[PDB]
Structure formats: C-alpha cells, structure tokens
C-alpha cells in the first residue's frame, strides 16, 4: 500500500520552500511571496500532500533527520485553511509531533506525551480508512509503533499533513523528505 506523496504548493505556507520534485520541504529564512488562493494555510508552516484519500490502506514514510521540531500525519480536506487552530484529533488532524529537540507528543486533545527510546529519523505513517486507523511507526526502531489513533471513522477525503517546524528564528532548516 506504499505510495507516492508529492506535496501540493498550493495549500504551501509562505514560510515553506518546496524542492522542484516536491518530494521535500523545509522552513524558510523570510516568507516568500506568493499569491492568495483559499487552498493556503496562511498561519503556520503547513502543507498538504496532492494524493486525495477516500478509502483503502495508505503507506508513506518521512526522513526528519538533524530536525529539533515537526508535525507529521493525516488531516481531513474540510480542515481550515486560513487563522488560528489547534492541531487535534478533534479539529481534523491526526499527526504525531516533536518540539523543544526532544518532546514527541500525539496530537490528541488534550495532548498524549510519548517516550520514545530510539528517537526516529525516519517515520512511517500509514491510514486504514475503512478502519478509521492512523499509525506511526518508528523505521529507526526496526517500526516499533509511535502511536496509533483508532476508531477516527472518517467521512469525507483525506490528506497527507507536513510541518517541517514553525518559525522562531531558530536553527529548524533541515527539510522534512519523503523517502523513496
Ligand atoms: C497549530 C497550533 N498548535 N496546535 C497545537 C500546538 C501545540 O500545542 N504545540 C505544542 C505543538 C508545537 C508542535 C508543532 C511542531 C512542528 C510544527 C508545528 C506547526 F504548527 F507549525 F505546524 C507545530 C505542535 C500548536 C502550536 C503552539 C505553539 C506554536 C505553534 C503551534
């Protein structure tokens, strides 16, 4: 069930800069400019993978090599796209971060804490749909489970969902890679 991501520049915030191949992305120094269109997440590093869900089982695997924050996982196509939300289960967004270099939390609400022995380089995320399943699998620790969200049941098309990290001035600039 492993597929091809490739990430959408249209739903790209400003902060994100996008390989030609769109198969990375990283955080940029300044924004760039880039025109206004409802797709775009204008508030936070964000963006979608182009690959639309609407059934079936989905495999796909991240390099966050050298990276002090991310936010991996899956979110629904309804979700806002424009101000201010909390990334949570509740909210259309079924991902696992880290932030502070070394805090691994599960996007529920309110948030779950992780303890991660290995820390991941590599992360797997697969969607069960008709199971309403999202799992994240740690590729370092020979795919020990991260974390799954279970009973979700889904309605409508979802997402692949990437943030290399927010903007803090800080030293966050190693991309997010989609491995082959
Ligand atoms: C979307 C708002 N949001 N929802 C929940 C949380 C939250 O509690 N914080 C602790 C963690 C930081 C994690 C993170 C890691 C990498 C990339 C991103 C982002 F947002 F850019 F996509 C976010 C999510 C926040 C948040 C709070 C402060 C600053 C920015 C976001």
């Keep these: ?15 994100l800069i996008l390989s030609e191949d ?14 206004g269109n409802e797709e775009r997440f204008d508030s936070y590093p964000m963006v979608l993978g182009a690959q639309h869900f609407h059934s079936g089982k989905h495999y796909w695997e991240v390099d966050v090599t050298g990276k002090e924050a991310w936010d991996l996982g899956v979110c629904r196509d309804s979700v806002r796209r424009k101000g201010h939300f909390l ?9 696992i971060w880290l932030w502070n270099k070394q805090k691994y939390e599960a996007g529920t609400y309110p948030q779950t804490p992780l303890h991660l022995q290995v820390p991941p380089c590599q992360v797997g995320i697969f969607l069960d749909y008709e199971a309403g399943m ?4 740690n590729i370092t620790d020979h795919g020990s489970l991260i974390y799954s ?5 889904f309605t409508g098309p979802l997402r692949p969902f990437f943030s ?13 890679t ?3």
């Design 178 to 180: 989609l491995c082959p």
């Design 1 to 15: 069930c492993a597929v091809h991501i490739t990430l959408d520049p249209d739903t790209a915030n400003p902060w």
């Design 164 to 176: 290399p990290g927010f903007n803090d001035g800080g030293k966050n600039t190693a991309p997010l």
């Design 22 to 35: 769109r198969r990375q992305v990283r955080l940029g120094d300044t924004q760039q400019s880039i025109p």
């Design 87 to 95: 990334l949570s289960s509740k909210s259309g967004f079924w991902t």
């Design 149 to 153: 969200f279970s009973e979700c049941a």
């Design 134 to 137: 999202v799992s994240f699998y």
